[PDB]
Point group: C2
Chain length 45, copies 2
Amino acid sequence: MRQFNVYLPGDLIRQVKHFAIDRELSLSALVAEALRSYLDEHQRQ
Amino acid sequence: MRQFNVYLPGDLIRQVKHFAIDRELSLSALVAEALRSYLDEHQ
């Protein structure tokens, strides 16, 4: 795993952490899933 | 806005970065949309 750094709205970051807490997910796992799901959804040729 | 630091698979990071290049997005815009869409769909 490598370090990934990006600017986001502070309230988005809070919503993501809240969501992780409710599903007992690590941030790394949740964020990875959200990114993979978006890339999958938006893939084109 | 604020810095968000998280550890991810290196190959996913590269994939994300390549995608942002091809779609002419900032990483901030891309990541924000992926997270927002994920949260939106799953609530």
